[PDB]
Amino acid sequence: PEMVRGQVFDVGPRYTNLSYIGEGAYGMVCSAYDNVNKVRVAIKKISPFEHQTYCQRTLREIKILLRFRHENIIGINDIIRAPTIEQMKDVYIVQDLMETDLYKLLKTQHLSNDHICYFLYQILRGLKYIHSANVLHRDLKPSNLLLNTTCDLKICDFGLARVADPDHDHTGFLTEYVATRWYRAPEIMLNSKGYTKSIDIWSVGCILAEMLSNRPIFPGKHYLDQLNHILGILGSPSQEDLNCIINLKARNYLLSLPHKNKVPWNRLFPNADSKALDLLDKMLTFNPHKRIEVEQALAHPYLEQYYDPSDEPIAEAPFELDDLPKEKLKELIFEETARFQP
């Protein structure tokens, strides 16, 4: 079998000419030549079968990416594994090769207003489809937005995704959370489990802010510091907003803080398009109930040159892994990948 840096990368015969790219969640990522469709592709090696949680995240994300079909969401081209459960020790996921991601791009490249507008349009177009399927991504950030050499953007990394569940969103103060800190909405730290669509819109708002200045807007160094970054910019929440927080620990925390005034967006981003800042404001709204939705963001004047609802498709149909032992998860991963076998 093919070796890359002393580890087996066993993807042939169809995929040859391997180059190391980096590291994903449960293994090595490589590029390779697809000898069928005469193009280079990306291949991730996944080795999750030892851990219940690796299995859960792997199954969830295979299920979601196989069900989804959208220009702005990464697809699965092929899946390589052993013919039997007994011999299956890893899984290889084949995907379109994307040159870069918005993270890498932002640490070296200034974005034109036209690039920012186009990227935001594609992010929201993809998110419209995701939300239309009753799915929350829950980990949107620059590194999860892949881009090719013509700036086609595709959302990836559905490992933390969930089916929306707004009726069961509520929780106590400072309840632990797994998704990436800088992109977490304020309510996550106060009273929210992240089971509502507004969680994703906050993340997109943070990404928009980051595209305007090439720096994260809220670089919290730890769980609570993240909330204090947000409030340093949005200012103290209104009485009316506080009234929607019933949890006393959460509300009393906010009440204990010195009054902070809002930093105006045009002072923070003096070269930004004024329509961009209007949309940013509506995405980075403190109160999740008043935060703009994906479809309304698409309809905002900033995106007017791209908006076309007839060309912004929804999922044909909307979308219990929690208790399943790893043994049953491996078996479901086996079944779920069966369509790619010879």
From Swiss-Prot:
What does the UniProt record report as the effect of altering residue 313 to R in this chain?
A: In NS13; results in increased MAPK signaling; increased translocation to the nucleus; reduced interaction with DUSP6; no effect on interaction with MAP2K1
Reaction(s) the record says it catalyses: L-seryl-[protein] + ATP = O-phospho-L-seryl-[protein] + ADP + H(+); L-threonyl-[protein] + ATP = O-phospho-L-threonyl-[protein] + ADP + H(+)
Phosphoserine: which positions carry it?
Answer: 19, 236, 238, 274
What does the UniProt entry say about where the protein is found? Cytoplasm, Cytoskeleton, Spindle; Nucleus; Cytoplasm, Cytoskeleton, Microtubule organizing center, Centrosome; Cytoplasm
Q: Which UniProt keywords apply?
A: Acetylation, Apoptosis, ATP-binding, Cell cycle, Cell junction, Cytoplasm, Cytoskeleton, Disease variant, DNA-binding, Host-virus interaction, Kinase, Membrane, Nucleotide-binding, Nucleus, Phosphoprotein, Repressor, Serine/threonine-protein kinase, Transcription, Transcription regulation, Transferase, Ubl conjugation
Q: Which CDD domains match?
A: STKc_ERK1_2_like (cd07849)
Q: Which Gene3D superfamilies match?
A: Phosphorylase Kinase, domain 1, Transferase(Phosphotransferase) domain 1
E.C. number(s) listed in UniProt: 2.7.11.24
Give the DNA-binding residues: 249-267
Which stretch carries the motif Cytoplasmic retention motif?
308-312
Its job: Serine/threonine kinase which acts as an essential component of the MAP kinase signal transduction pathway. MAPK1/ERK2 and MAPK3/ERK1 are the 2 MAPKs which play an important role in the MAPK/ERK cascade. They participate also in a signaling cascade initiated by activated KIT and KITLG/SCF. Depending on the cellular context, the MAPK/ERK cascade mediates diverse biological functions such as cell growth, adhesion, survival and differentiation through the regulation of transcription, translation, cytoskeletal rearrangements.
| Protein name according to UniProt | Mitogen-activated protein kinase 1
Q: What is the lineage of its organism?
A: Eukaryota, Metazoa, Chordata, Craniata, Vertebrata
Gene from which this protein is expressed: MAPK1
